């Protein structure tokens, strides 16, 4: 037969931090693998659509 | 179809090539062998080096 009831209250403010987006990158596949190299590019062509 | 599409990357090409090496030091003593007062014998052979 015992119940607890608040006689006062507090207004509390808290903070929730959520990521929304990441840095958008783009990669030049040929330049990265075979930068300014004709021979490397010609061998790179043999790997198709990668 | 209507939209924005990603195509091949662009580069700004070079217009000329440059090659830089340090000041050329003294040369092999080839001049002394050919521009000699008297030529060397088979036994008086030289060993150009370094």
From Swiss-Prot, chain A:
Glycosylation positions in this chain: 8
Part of the full-length chain shown: 710 to 759 of 1273
Entry function: Precursor of the fusion protein processed in the biosynthesis of the S protein and the formation of virus particle. Mediates fusion of the virion and cellular membranes by functioning as a class I viral fusion protein. Contains two viral fusion peptides that are unmasked after cleavage. The S2/S2' cleavage occurs during virus entry at the cell membrane by host TMPRSS2 or during endocytosis by host CSTL.
Cysteine pairings via disulfide bonds: 34-40
Tree of life domain: Viruses
Protein name, as recorded: Spike protein S2
């Amino acid at each position: 037969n015992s119940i607890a009831i608040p006689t006062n209250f507090t207004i509390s403010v808290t903070t929730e931090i959520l990521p929304v987006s990441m840095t958008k990158t783009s990669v030049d596949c040929t330049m990265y693998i075979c930068g300014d190299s004709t021979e490397c590019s010609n061998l790179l062509l043999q790997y198709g659509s990668f | 179809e209507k939209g924005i599409y990603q195509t091949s990357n662009f580069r700004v090409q070079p217009t000329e090539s440059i090659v830089r090496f340090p000041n050329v030091t003294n040369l092999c003593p080839f001049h002394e062998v050919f521009n000699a007062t008297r030529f060397a014998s088979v036994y008086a052979w030289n060993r150009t080096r370094i």
